[PDB]
Design an enzyme around this catalytic site. Structure first.
Site, PDB file in Angstrom:
ATOM      1  N   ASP A  94       0.656  -1.169   0.123  1.00  0.00           N
ATOM      2  CA  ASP A  94       0.023   0.010   0.219  1.00  0.00           C
ATOM      3  C   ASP A  94       0.919   1.360   0.037  1.00  0.00           C
ATOM      4  O   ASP A  94       0.353   2.228  -0.408  1.00  0.00           O
ATOM      5  CB  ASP A  94      -0.796   0.144   1.144  1.00  0.00           C
ATOM      6  CG  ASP A  94      -1.993  -0.981   1.064  1.00  0.00           C
ATOM      7  OD1 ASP A  94      -2.354  -1.234  -0.025  1.00  0.00           O
ATOM      8  OD2 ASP A  94      -2.653  -1.483   2.179  1.00  0.00           O
TER       9      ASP A  94
ATOM     10  N   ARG B 242       3.276   1.895 -11.349  1.00  0.00           N
ATOM     11  CA  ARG B 242       3.388   0.700 -11.219  1.00  0.00           C
ATOM     12  C   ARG B 242       3.543  -0.052 -12.634  1.00  0.00           C
ATOM     13  O   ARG B 242       4.465  -0.936 -13.073  1.00  0.00           O
ATOM     14  CB  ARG B 242       2.432  -0.151 -10.425  1.00  0.00           C
ATOM     15  CG  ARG B 242       2.455   0.386  -8.968  1.00  0.00           C
ATOM     16  CD  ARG B 242       1.032  -0.386  -8.287  1.00  0.00           C
ATOM     17  NE  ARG B 242       1.137   0.033  -7.048  1.00  0.00           N
ATOM     18  CZ  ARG B 242       0.316  -0.424  -6.306  1.00  0.00           C
ATOM     19  NH1 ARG B 242      -0.770  -1.460  -6.504  1.00  0.00           N
ATOM     20  NH2 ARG B 242      -0.062  -0.021  -5.009  1.00  0.00           N
TER      21      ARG B 242
ATOM     22  N   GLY C 164      -2.185   3.211 -14.767  1.00  0.00           N
ATOM     23  CA  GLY C 164      -1.551   2.873 -15.653  1.00  0.00           C
ATOM     24  C   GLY C 164      -0.208   3.680 -16.024  1.00  0.00           C
ATOM     25  O   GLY C 164       0.095   3.727 -17.136  1.00  0.00           O
TER      26      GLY C 164
ATOM     27  N   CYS D 262      -2.219  -0.831 -13.917  1.00  0.00           N
ATOM     28  CA  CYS D 262      -2.504  -0.949 -12.628  1.00  0.00           C
ATOM     29  C   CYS D 262      -3.845  -0.071 -12.521  1.00  0.00           C
ATOM     30  O   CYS D 262      -4.863  -0.466 -13.085  1.00  0.00           O
ATOM     31  CB  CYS D 262      -1.162  -0.238 -11.714  1.00  0.00           C
ATOM     32  SG  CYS D 262      -0.595   1.225 -12.364  1.00  0.00           S
ATOM     33  N   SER D 263      -4.021   0.905 -11.457  1.00  0.00           N
ATOM     34  CA  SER D 263      -5.046   1.728 -11.374  1.00  0.00           C
ATOM     35  C   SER D 263      -4.976   2.818 -12.459  1.00  0.00           C
ATOM     36  O   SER D 263      -6.091   2.962 -13.507  1.00  0.00           O
ATOM     37  CB  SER D 263      -5.264   2.378 -10.032  1.00  0.00           C
ATOM     38  OG  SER D 263      -6.272   3.260 -10.044  1.00  0.00           O
TER      39      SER D 263
END
EC number: 3.1.3.48
Length: 282
Positions: free
Chosen positions: A184, A224, A221, A218-219
């Site tokens: 997180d 990560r 893009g 990812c969320s």
């Protein structure tokens, strides 16, 4: 030679590493995103500040009725071998799930990489856009069926069968690589986890030589997702050329999509991965 280069970058509390990373901040950012800013596409973007460039966005086949039916928040990304080696995209929304699978089909995608959980710290990061069981589901005009699901310590591998409703004989196998241990806060606790995840995916990419781009998301893009792609590129360079150009890789990513490798900490992590590979070999 890299070990000495990285040591000089880390000297003086990462002074030169930070200077180098900041040299990249403006790369690619004078390119327009007008298509993504059209009002008809406003609901298709998860984040206002993460839009694809017009020059590199992935286009869906146009639906005769809607002029903005070609839009998805996704960008082509070059790799070591192809100008369109990856497609980077955001975590699909409920309203873009059908568009996501349409892109997968039209772009001849055989491998999808997901580097996020759907929910993290109680915040929705990505919609669960694949079947939860072994029963088939339609996403638009495409039939999707999960053939297998293998939950490993640091990632989960799923196999999907996809086919258009018109040609049930012309199906395709898709592999889905879900990295489930990105913490997180910050970057993964070890370099070994993402190195081995990347090597796993790359081995499967190399087995489908006729495939289209590899999808990575990812969320948003970028962060990560950009770390995954950069690591994939530089591990290939290390095995082949025995050379490594992390700066050039991130530069090339930034030309094609905003914020790729979004934090200095992710930039450091890439250098640590290469160092750790070299150390394990010496």
């Amino acid at each position: 030679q890299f070990e000495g280069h990285f040591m000089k970058l880390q000297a003086d509390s990462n002074y030169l590493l930070s200077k180098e990373y900041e040299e990249l901040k403006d790369v690619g950012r004078n390119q327009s995103c007008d298509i993504a800013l059209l009002p008809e596409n406003r609901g298709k973007n998860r984040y206002n500040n993460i839009l694809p460039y017009d020059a590199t966005r992935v286009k869906l086949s146009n639906v005769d009725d809607d002029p903005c039916s070609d839009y998805i928040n996704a960008s082509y990304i070059p790799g070591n071998n192809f100008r369109r080696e990856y497609i980077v995209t955001q975590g699909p929304l409920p309203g873009t799930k059908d568009d996501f699978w349409k892109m997968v089909w039209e772009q001849n995608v055989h491998n999808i990489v997901m580097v996020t959980q759907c929910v993290e710290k109680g915040r929705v990061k990505c919609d669960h856009y694949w079947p939860a069981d072994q029963d088939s589901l339609y996403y638009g005009d495409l039939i999707l069926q999960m053939l297998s699901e293998s939950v490993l310590p640091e990632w989960t591998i799923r196999e999907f069968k996809i086919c258009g409703e018109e040609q049930l004989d012309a199906h395709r196998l898709i592999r889905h690589f879900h990295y489930t241990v990105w913490p997180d806060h910050g970057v993964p606790e070890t370099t070994q986890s993402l190195i081995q995840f990347v090597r796993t995916v790359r081995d499967y990419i190399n087995r489908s030589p006729g495939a289209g781009p590899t999808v990575v998301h990812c969320s948003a893009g970028v962060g990560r997702t950009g770390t995954f792609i950069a690591l994939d590129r530089i591990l290939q360079q290390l095995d082949s050329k025995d050379s490594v150009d992390i700066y050039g890789a991130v530069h090339d990513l930034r030309l094609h999509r905003v914020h790729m490798v979004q934090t200095e900490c992710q930039y450091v992590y890439l250098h640590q991965c290469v160092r750790d590979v070299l150390r394990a070999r010496k």
